[PDB]
Ligand SMILES: CCCCCCCCCCCCO[C@@H]1O[C@H](CO)[C@@H](O[C@H]2O[C@H](CO)[C@@H](O)[C@H](O)[C@H]2O)[C@H](O)[C@H]1O
């Protein structure tokens with residue numbers, strides 16, 4: 001059986017395990033050496049109830065743009081981290097006793113529970129694909145639908161309170177995202193992005209020596225322009241502070257930052273003077289920084305990200321939804337808080353973003369092979385091995401989820417992913433009949449990301465316009481056109 | 487309350503509106519007139535290019 | 539080529555619907571066996587103590603006595 | 604209905620087979636396919652006209 | 660006393676109930692459709708009279724013999 | 728070509744008898760014998776009359792002597808005890824504490 | 825804080841009493857009886873009784889029952905059993921010595937405890 005088949009190679013596996021541990025140690029040393037000087041400090045923050053940490057990718061998932069590492073090497077890093085996770089049953093005899101060998105036997109029974117060393121294959125890509133096709137796709141295919149249902153019922157709420165909890169403008173997008181297994185039509189990622197309307201406006205407060213300022217597209221454009229100009233720091237900081245005071249005046253004319261009038265957040269006013277400390281009409285006591293002149297406004301280097309996720313936040317998800325998201329992403333989930341599973345999910349998210357960056361450095365998706373792209377999509381959890389799609393469809397799927405994960409929101413990511421895991425079984429043998437049309441094929445051009453899409457009104461859905469029909473499409477798609485024709 | 491025992495799919499059908507008309511309308515609203523005449527020139531020169 | 543989002547059944551798909559019906563109607567079947575058993579258990583019962591009783595029925599559960 | 608009376612008559616017979624009633628089923632699939640047919644015929648006529656112009 | 664939702668059996672939408680199956684070509688089988696198969700005893704009534712007489716008599720004989 | 732274990736029409740015909748029960752079909756049909764031969768009417772009267780009967784017997788005659796007597800005189804004395812208890816001359820002819 | 829909820833008609837109460845009266849009307853509809861074979865002893869004044877004219881309804885439902893109309897009467901002989909045994913016991917002759925030694929449920933009997 002597989003027990004004796006794996007026991008036969010158990011002696012030959014320890015050397016490979018230790019070699020992999022050495023590679024992991026070297027790689028983590030290198031990566032942390034880079035991270036400890038280029039990456040900022042994402043402080044730990046606690047949930048609304050202030051008992052457990054909460055995690056978000058915008059702050060904690062950092063991408064080393066400029067990482068001198070091969071994509072296959074990063075795949076090795078992540079896969080060996082998962083192998084370290086899978087090596088945990090070796091501690092059972094060292095905590096239970098000599099009778100703690102039966103857990104090790106159960107571990108050695110199934111090959112999917114095991115690390116890389118017990119596999120006959122050599123290449124990391126073929127090895128990962130074997131593991132997925134043997135164990136991982138099956139485990140994910142039995143969690144996908146029930147996670148989709150939990151996400152639905154998290155939006156719409158329980159016990160017939162949809163008229164109190166759902167929104168009437170995201171309705172058609174909700175239907176297209178969650179009930180496309182009924183129609184068989186493809187989905188547009190922008191309709192999944194429309195789910196963020198349940199949340200508020202995500203803001204970024206830059207902390208200065210006087211007051212916090214809300215970041216805008218204009219200020220960000222100016223800062224990117226100044227950073228691209230490659231000026232001396234005496235001019236760089238001056239231009240940055242000029243843009244900063246300009247934006248400060250702009251928001252002061254707007255009526256202050258958006259955070260002042262949001263439930264759960266707020267900026268305090270000047271402190272009050274109590275009793276005899278009140279000096280006539282001056283009932284307030286301004287801060288020390290009020291003495292500083294406004295022309296000396298300088299950025300402290302500190303930032304505060306506020307997703308304002310009132311319905312989407314991972315804190316309010318629950319004990320079950322987090323565990324099922326980690327099952328669906330093949331992460332550890334048992335016997336841990338939702339904060340620890342949140343961190344595991346954010347680490348996976350960061351890995352996927354770093355992998356996207358390295359692919360873009362290595363020349364995009366088309367430079368990859370077919371098996372490598374299949375394994376990438378399996379890691380992204382948008383493909384099941386019982387599909388056998390084309391290369392253009394795989395590339396379009398990757399582009400879709402890459403743009404969707406660029407927004408840094410796990411809820412919409414899971415809503416997108418779970419749609420590709422709704423498979424049925426027929427009770428009859430003759431039905432379903434053999435189709436007559438060819439397989440579904442697409443291209444990178446069919447994905448509309450460079451254009452905005454308004455939310456369709458309820459019970460008034462609009463047809464899908466191809467990007468090619470837009471004006472100047474041959475100009476906008478020229479990069480993708482050159483990449484595909486080449 | 488008796489919504490399940492009816493068929494109002496004909497009472498509520500998807501509209502036949504083409505969003506491309508609103509897109510070209512926003513394109514013309516953003517573009518000036520001399521660029522429209524330039525585009526007529528681009529088309530004419532493309533016709534002569536296909537001819538030659 | 540087959541139609542998409544279709545597959546053969548697997549063990550983790552659970553039992554069929556007819557099997558779920560056969561699971562559901564087992565309590566309804568045992569009802570007919572247990573309600574007569576309830577009536578017989580009540581009717582063929584005898585009290586355990588009287589004013590004259592020098593002894594009371596004892597039931598050693600674990601045989602410790 | 605009778606003079607000074609109204610009544611309800613029920614038959615007494617075992618029904619060996621069900622009684623069928625033609626309730627036509629509304630579906631959008633035939634009109635979908637006919638729309639596809641018309642659009643494809645439009646494009647085919649368009650291609651024929653364009654070939655006739657380009658070659659003649 | 661009670662709201663209309665409780666009276667009508669639904670808060671917002673009345674759900675369809677699957678009708679009862681009929682099994683064309685045979686009688687219904689329910690707890691109330693059993694007299695079709697089991698009528699009151701009518702076949703052995705005269706035997707009942709005879710056997711009651713004989714049972715009474717034989718019992719009385721053996722009881723009197725035991726008592727005596 | 729059904730791939731599932733198709734259940735016969737007669738098996739469905741029999742299961743319908745078991746799953747087409749209603750609440751009143753259980754309540755009244757099982758409660759009538761229960762109420763009649765239960766702790767209210769018959770079994771209760773029997774089993775609660777026995778307690779008073781054998782209390783009176785063990786007080787007046789003794790359980791050993793009662794067991795030694797004949798079944799006929801046993802039943803006679805039991806009937807007398809039942810009459811004394813039903814009468815309840817000491818409670819003012821009232822079965823209350 | 826200021827949700828502005830519209831009134832929900834399902835939360836009103838305008839059907840419970842009508843439904844109860846419908847059930848009661850269905851009940852009383854089975855009290856309809858013909859003139860032939862009709863007799864009801866009125867009161868001494870000549871006015872009708874209360875329980876009298878609402879026996880036909882109950883027995884018309886007993887007619888429609890299946891098991892209770894053949895089972896629930898088997899507890900009725902027990903009433904006559906009590907009627908007879910009570911009269912036997914009202915004047916039963918008993919031994920004075922046994923009554924003085926073992927009175928049934930008498931107070932201050934130390935053999936009982938009080
Ligand atoms: C009158 C004084 C004030 C007290 C008022 C409250 C009294 C409550 C006690 C009477 C309860 C009657 O309870 C009654 O149960 C039946 C089930 O048989 C419910 O019945 C409901 O559900 C069933 C199925 O489950 C539906 O088919 C039905 O249409 C619906 O009415 C009634 O809606 C409820 O009214």
Ligand SMILES: COCCOCCOCCOc1ccc(C(C)(C)CC(C)(C)C)cc1
Nearest residue numbers: 668748749750751752753754755758844847
């Ligand atoms: C004033 O009312 C006195 C009547 O109360 C009799 C108590 O009966 C106990 C329950 O009786 C039933 C049985 C079935 C039902 C129905 C038929 C409504 C059950 C249902 C809902 C499953 C169809 C209702 C009550």
Ligand SMILES: COCCOCCOCCOc1ccc(C(C)(C)CC(C)(C)C)cc1
Nearest residue numbers: 847848851852855856874876877878879881
């Ligand atoms: C489940 O709850 C419904 C139970 O309702 C029982 C109501 O009980 C009262 C019925 O009793 C009567 C009273 C009067 C009458 C009739 C006598 C109305 C008067 C008549 C026939 C002379 C007009 C009939 C039955």
